[PDB]
Amino acid sequence: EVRTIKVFTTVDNINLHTQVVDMSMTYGQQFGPTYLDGADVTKIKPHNSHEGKTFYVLPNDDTLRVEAFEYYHTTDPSFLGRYMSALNHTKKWKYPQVNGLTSIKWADNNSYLATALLTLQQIELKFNPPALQDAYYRARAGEAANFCALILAYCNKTVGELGDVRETMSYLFQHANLDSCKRVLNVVCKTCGQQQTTLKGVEAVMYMGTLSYEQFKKGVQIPCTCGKQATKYLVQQESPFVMMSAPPAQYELKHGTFTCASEYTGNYQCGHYKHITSKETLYCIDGALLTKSSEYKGPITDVFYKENSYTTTIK
Numbered sequence: 001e002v003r004t005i006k007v008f009t010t011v012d013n014i015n016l017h018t019q020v021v022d023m024s025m026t027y028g029q030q031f032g033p034t035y036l037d038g039a040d041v042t043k044i045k046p047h048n049s050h051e052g053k054t055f056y057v058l059p060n061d062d063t064l065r066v067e068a069f070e071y072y073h074t075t076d077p078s079f080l081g082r083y084m085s086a087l088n089h090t091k092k093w094k095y096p097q098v099n100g101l102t103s104i105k106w107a108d109n110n111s112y113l114a115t116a117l118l119t120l121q122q123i124e125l126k127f128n129p130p131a132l133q134d135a136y137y138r139a140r141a142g143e144a145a146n147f148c149a150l151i152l153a154y155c156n157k158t159v160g161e162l163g164d165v166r167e168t169m170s171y172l173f174q175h176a177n178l179d180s181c182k183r184v185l186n187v188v189c190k191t192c193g194q195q196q197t198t199l200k201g202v203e204a205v206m207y208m209g210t211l212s213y214e215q216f217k218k219g220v221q222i223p224c225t226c227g228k229q230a231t232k233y234l235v236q237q238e239s240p241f242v243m244m245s246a247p248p249a250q251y252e253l254k255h256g257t258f259t260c261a262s263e264y265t266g267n268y269q270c271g272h273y274k275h276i277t278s279k280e281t282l283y284c285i286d287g288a289l290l291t292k293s294s295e296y297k298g299p300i301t302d303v304f305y306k307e308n309s310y311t312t313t314i315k
């Protein structure tokens with residue numbers, strides 16, 4: 001016989017689209033790659049247990065091509081599957097409230113996410129893909145599966161993959177409004193004609209090489225091309241935060257001196273991030289785990305500091 005239920009496809013889960021689907025044929029046969037709340041259903045045949053429901057689909061047509069662009073800000077042919085494949089595990093994670101931040105209960109090596117995520121609920125960033133806008137907001141409200149799958153999709157990391165906090169933040173920064181952000185640097189050797197540079201946007205809020213912000217304020221000897229070693233020093237900073245990164249190295253975090261940091265313990269192959277946040281005292285957040293002390297020595301990779309406006313006084 002002939003049987004057909006009605007369902008809606010969507011790329012953004014806001015704009016729906018009426019379809020009537022033949023209950024013999026798989027969704028793969030009708031819409032192509034299709035997903036139900038993360039589940040690949042391309043090869044399942046429609047249950048009447050599905051009438052009224054929203055499947056995500058690959059952006060096959062132009063209507064879809066434009067909704068997906070406007071919501072996500074990408075045209076990566078693969079973005080959508082990546083986002084559903086990741087959502088299909090993120091939906092099953094636990095996002096506990098830990099000291100009033102949303103964290104993630106450790107699974108599938110999401111250590112780097114929990115710390116990235118905890119960093120966000122802590123610094124002033126505004127996302128440009130409405131997708132992130134929307135998903136972040138639920139995440140703050142402690143509903144974070146979507147935000148997580150979204151980060152996975154924007155980073156081309158699949159659930160399980162080993163990820164790096166720095167690179168992760170590079171990706172989210174790319175999709176965040178930091179135009180007004182402005183860094184001016186100068187690098188002086190003792191006998192050179194000391195060259196200066198100006199950095200704008202993301203390039204202005206990330207530095208790789210030292211954890212210490214005040215250190216960078218005072219000068220950092222760098223592998224320069226002079227006759228001696230040259231000091232790199234920060235001339236001017238315009239931004240709502242800065243991020244200092246560097247390879248994992250034993251470092252001490254002092255209450256009241258930073259906003260937060262990332263500890264990486266292990267090696268390239270095997271290791272674990274943790275997040276330290278400066279509040280009434282030092283709190284160390286490790287997924288669902290919480291500990292406290294007053295001072296913290298340990299192998300740090302990333303330290304973030306609140307900022308707005310800084311002129312150096314060094315001549």
Ligand SMILES: CC#CCn1c(N2CCC[C@@H](N)C2)nc2c1c(=O)n(Cc1nc(C)c3ccccc3n1)c(=O)n2C
Pocket residue numbers: 069070073074128129130173174175176177178179201202
């Ligand atoms: C709302 C809004 C907005 C503006 N916008 C648009 N469009 C395209 C058509 C649809 C319409 N929504 C406007 N696409 C965008 C952005 C945007 O801000 N960022 C973040 C970004 N990206 C980069 C590369 C940055 C670089 C430096 C500083 C900040 C930056 N911020 C993006 O990544 N993409 C892809």
